[PDB]
């Protein structure tokens, strides 16, 4: 099912590098630059000449070293807004997958690793001519600088009531009668109740899938069964809470319908927090105490909590923010909020666990607007000519080496009007 595509001296490219790196980028919001065949193997032929050059220098490149990504494999790509067949309708198996993310992004990294040794001009606090004598020819096209803020919080878990999870235990011993005495389907009730999405639209299933993979009380409480419409008992997980009826199994697969019911937070009990997180801020404002030690008290994001309370932004690895890369409730809280001003208790989507929690911010700096000044704004100008000039000399050094390292390309696909088309006689 797969061809060679190109060959990049001793390494080679598959179709099926192709087509997975075409999937994910059309994930990534890819907008093409015209047939993807063109440019795809392309993009991949020049993350070889880095990786080959990567090499050839010295191991100075840790060529990834394979676990180095591991970290980030896990941590961003398994984290998805879904996974297991979600992931898996393209081709290849989730193993695999594994293998080739990991293979695709330890090769990324080195890529990184090598442009960043391939230039030694970028220096810090160093004129680069004054700023090429200070946006040399400046045209009547500018750039914007939009507005920078700097943001702190205090953040509260809402502690999930006991009589809600004894209500979803209810809902479902009841669920468990209903079906039993026959006065409605379970495939009906696991479709309108479960909050398994994706189990719930087919019916409540979960297909012949096993493996272990199931999370381990469920599994442990799954096999166990064996009279077919058997009503499990309510076993809690990392998810929420499950009753399960076995389909079918064959060997250690096994096909088992679950109605999922997640204890989910009262609006009272949001209520309640946010009035104390009022009462901390009224506290906070008669300085009887500074946001900056409730921080450290009584925050509860623990990345932040120690460090002021202040947010820190993933883009730019620093505390400023741009109105964007913030979460949808802070910036929409911090619009209307001025300098050094406390914000009302709100309740906001924890990003990463994707539960409720309340909290409150303090805008701690805010540059509004503006425009590129060059009295500033000056290490914007510097970074912008750097980097222009660093991309025109690796596409020097990339013009270079594609005439001095070897290229072979299907006959199929030596068609496309390639971009840096050094690749031919």
């Given at each position: 099912i797969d061809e060679v595509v190109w060959v990049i001296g001793d390494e080679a490219i598959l179709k099926s590098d192709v087509e997975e790196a075409r999937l994910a980028a059309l994930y990534e919001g890819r907008k093409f630059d015209g047939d993807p065949y063109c440019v795809i193997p392309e993009e991949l032929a020049v993350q070889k000449l880095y990786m080959h050059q990567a090499v050839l220098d010295s191991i100075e490149v840790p060529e990834a070293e394979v676990i180095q990504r591991v970290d980030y494999q896990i941590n961003n790509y398994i984290q998805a807004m879904g996974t297991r067949e979600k992931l898996e309708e393209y081709f290849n198996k989730t193993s695999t997958q594994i293998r080739e993310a990991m293979r695709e992004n330890a090769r990324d990294g080195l890529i990184v690793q090598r442009m960043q040794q391939k230039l030694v001009g970028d220096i810090k606090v160093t004129?680069?001519?004054?700023?090429?004598?200070?946006?040399?020819?400046?045209?009547?096209?500018?750039?914007?600088?939009?507005?920078?803020?700097?943001?702190?919080?205090?953040?509260?878990?809402?502690?999930?009531?006991?009589?809600?999870?004894e209500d979803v235990k209810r809902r479902l011993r009841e669920y468990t009668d209903r079906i039993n005495k026959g006065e409605s389907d379970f495939s009906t009730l696991a479709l309108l109740y479960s909050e398994d999405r994706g189990s719930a639209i087919k019916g409540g299933e979960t297909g012949f899938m096993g493996k272990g993979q199931m999370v381990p009380e469920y599994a442990n409480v799954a096999f166990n069964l064996q009279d077919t419409k058997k009503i499990s008992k309510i076993v809690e997980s990392e998810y929420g809470f499950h009753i399960i009826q076995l389909i079918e199994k064959r060997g250690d697969r096994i096909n088992t319908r679950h109605i999922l019911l997640k204890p989910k937070v009262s609006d009272k009990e949001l209520d309640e927090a946010n009035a104390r997180l009022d009462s901390i801020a009224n506290d906070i404002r008669s300085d009887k105490f500074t946001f900056d030690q409730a921080a450290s008290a009584l925050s509860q994001d623990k990345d932040t909590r120690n460090?002021?309370?202040?947010?820190?932004?993933?883009?730019?690895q620093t505390a400023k923010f741009e109105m964007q890369d913030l979460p949808q409730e802070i910036a929409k809280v911090v619009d209307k909020m001025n300098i050094g001003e406390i914000s009302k208790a709100f309740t906001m989507v924890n990003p990463k666990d994707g539960k409720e929690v309340c909290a409150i911010v303090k805008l701690k700096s805010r540059i509004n607007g503006h425009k590129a000044t060059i009295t500033d704004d000056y290490q914007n100008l510097k970074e912008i000519v750097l980097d222009k000039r660093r991309e025109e000399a690796l596409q020097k050094w990339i013009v270079e080496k594609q005439k001095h390292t070897y290229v072979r390309i299907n006959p199929a696909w030596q068609r496309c009007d390639f971009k840096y088309p050094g690749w031919i006689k």
């Open positions: 004129p680069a001519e004054v700023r090429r004598y200070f946006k040399e020819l400046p045209q009547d096209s500018i750039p914007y600088v939009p507005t920078q803020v700097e943001v702190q919080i205090i953040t509260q878990q809402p502690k999930i009531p006991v009589a809600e999870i460090n002021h309370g202040l947010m820190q932004n993933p883009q730019n």
